[PDB]
């Protein structure tokens, strides 16, 4: 909703989508750890399949680094991004209903 006013860009575009909207027991778990040293924002990433449906599966795993960025900016807040819109069937609009 605002202007670009940006300087940094790092994008890799192998394009495919396999969302497969389902209500079944969860078998896919992503995990991302975000931190920074000296300004070098480091983001470690991992993914794994599980079996449980509702709670968090308790076992043990490991995480590894996936990306680094020289952001050089003070960071205090963060908010996640969700995306969901329904067909014509839902009378509640995108912002309204889903």
């Amino acid at each position: 909703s605002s202007a670009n006013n940006c300087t940094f860009e790092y994008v890799s575009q192998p394009f495919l989508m396999d969302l497969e909207g389902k209500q079944g027991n969860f078998k896919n778990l992503r995990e991302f750890v975000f931190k920074n040293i000296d300004g070098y924002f480091k983001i470690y990433s991992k993914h794994t399949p599980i079996n449980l449906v509702r709670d968090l599966p308790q076992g043990f795993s490991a995480l590894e680094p996936l990306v680094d960025l020289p952001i050089g900016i003070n960071i205090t807040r963060f908010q996640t991004l969700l995306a969901l819109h329904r067909s014509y069937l839902t009378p509640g609009d995108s912002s309204s209903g889903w």
């Binding site: 000296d38 300004g39 020289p70 050089g72 900016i73 003070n74």
Partner: protein
């Protein structure tokens, strides 16, 4: 100019608001020692070393 604290290494201070000197809430304006936050070097061409 004269950021109220010290900096974290390798960071950019992108600010416009006027730094409060002399305890002055300023709307980007002057007052009792309310000096502009930015400063431009007065490098007169062919100056002293």
């Amino acid at each position: 100019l004269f950021r109220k604290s010290n900096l974290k290494p390798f960071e950019r201070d992108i600010s416009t608001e006027i730094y409060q000197a002399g305890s002055t809430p300023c709307n980007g304006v002057e007052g009792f020692n309310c000096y502009f936050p930015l400063q431009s070097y007065g490098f007169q061409p062919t100056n002293g070393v």
